[PDB]
Amino acid sequence: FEERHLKYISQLGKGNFGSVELCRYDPLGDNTGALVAVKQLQHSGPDQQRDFQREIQILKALHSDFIVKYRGVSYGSLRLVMEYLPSGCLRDFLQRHRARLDASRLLLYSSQICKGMEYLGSRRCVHRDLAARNILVESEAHVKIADFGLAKLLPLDKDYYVVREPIFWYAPESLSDNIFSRQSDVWSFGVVLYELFTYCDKSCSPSAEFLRMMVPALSRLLELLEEGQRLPAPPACPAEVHELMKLCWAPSPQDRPSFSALGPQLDML
Ligand SMILES: *CCC(=O)Nc1cccc(-n2c(-c3nc(-c4cnn(C5CCN(C)CC5)c4)cnc3N)nc3ccccc32)c1
């Protein structure tokens, strides 16, 4: 993509180090292009540049109807071009349209994220940042997984990555030892199920609820969880959905289900 032809339209979100923009790719120069989401880093230390170059590679190598489709890059500051999903992130989506959405639909959105994550597993990829806010809505019927800004691939003959270089979605062994894995994303998925069936309600949000249950955070959370404390059953959440969450939140990652194992259970409800 030629920088000069990525004609700016509007800004969609603004982060700590980097922000995303809405653009139209009009190479013919006649206001008739294709609408893409473009991502840059503004003020960013070398640590954040190395990360952005992986995202571009990881995201490029993924081909799944439940992950944001990479389109290309620009100038190489390097800009990452992706498809535009105008319904915006699921967290804010479930809030707005809470009335119209029912359990059946939340199951559907679960199924799709499950399948999505599963695919990441097959690629030996750990999202490390899986939550309702990092889901996006294509349509009422379709959601895609997003922000691979903290995604890391597994070392070629290992099931886990110890990261040296967010908190309420982590697993104990990620809180305690900064160990990350497929099996840790299953934990995180347990949390997104909570988020889904609370319609991401701010009041009983994962953040609020763990704060209401308890000196710093990481260590107070790691202790709570180690002691067996988990997030509450959401108001009207069905029994099977609540059970799948508990299984997702198992202390030992080897005992947590796989997305391969999760999918069929969610789909048969
Ligand atoms: C709920 C959290 C949140 O705000 N997330 C978020 C904001 C901005 C950009 C991304 N993001 C994209 C991406 N975003 C959109 C998008 C964002 N907002 N909209 C709608 C605009 C119109 N209004 C009325 C409703 C909201 C659309 C569309 N397409 C994409 N690709 N992509 C990435 C990739 C990495 C990080 C963040 C991304 C998310």
From Swiss-Prot:
Residue positions of the active site: 129
Family: Belongs to the protein kinase superfamily. Tyr protein kinase family. JAK subfamily.
Function according to Swiss-Prot or TrEMBL: Non-receptor tyrosine kinase involved in various processes such as cell growth, development, or differentiation. Mediates essential signaling events in both innate and adaptive immunity and plays a crucial role in hematopoiesis during T-cells development. In the cytoplasm, plays a pivotal role in signal transduction via its association with type I receptors sharing the common subunit gamma such as IL2R, IL4R, IL7R, IL9R, IL15R and IL21R.
Tissues showing expression: In NK cells and an NK-like cell line but not in resting T-cells or in other tissues. The S-form is more commonly seen in hematopoietic lines, whereas the B-form is detected in cells both of hematopoietic and epithelial origins.
Annotated positions binding ATP: 12-20, 39
Domain of life: Eukaryota
Processing and modification events after translation: Tyrosine phosphorylated in response to IL-2 and IL-4. Dephosphorylation of Tyr-160 and Tyr-161 by PTPN2 negatively regulates cytokine-mediated signaling.
Outcome when changing residue 119 to F: About 80% loss of STAT5a activation
Pathology noted in the entry: Severe combined immunodeficiency autosomal recessive T-cell-negative/B-cell-positive/NK-cell-negative: A form of severe combined immunodeficiency (SCID), a genetically and clinically heterogeneous group of rare congenital disorders characterized by impairment of both humoral and cell-mediated immunity, leukopenia, and low or absent antibody levels. Patients present in infancy recurrent, persistent infections by opportunistic organisms. The common characteristic of all types of SCID is absence of T-cell-mediated cellular immunity due to a defect in T-cell development.
Stretch of the intact protein here: 817 to 1098 of 1124
Compartment annotation: Endomembrane system; Cytoplasm
Residue numbers bearing the Phosphotyrosine modification: 84, 119, 160-161
Species for this entry: Homo sapiens (Human)
Effect of residue 90 to S: In T(-)B(+)NK(-) SCID
Name under which the protein is recorded: Tyrosine-protein kinase JAK3
Note on domains (UniProt): Possesses two phosphotransferase domains. The second one probably contains the catalytic domain, while the presence of slight differences suggest a different role for domain 1.
Residue ranges annotated for the Protein kinase domain, each copy included: 6-269
Quaternary structure and partners: Interacts with STAM2 and MYO18A. Interacts with SHB. Interacts with CD69.
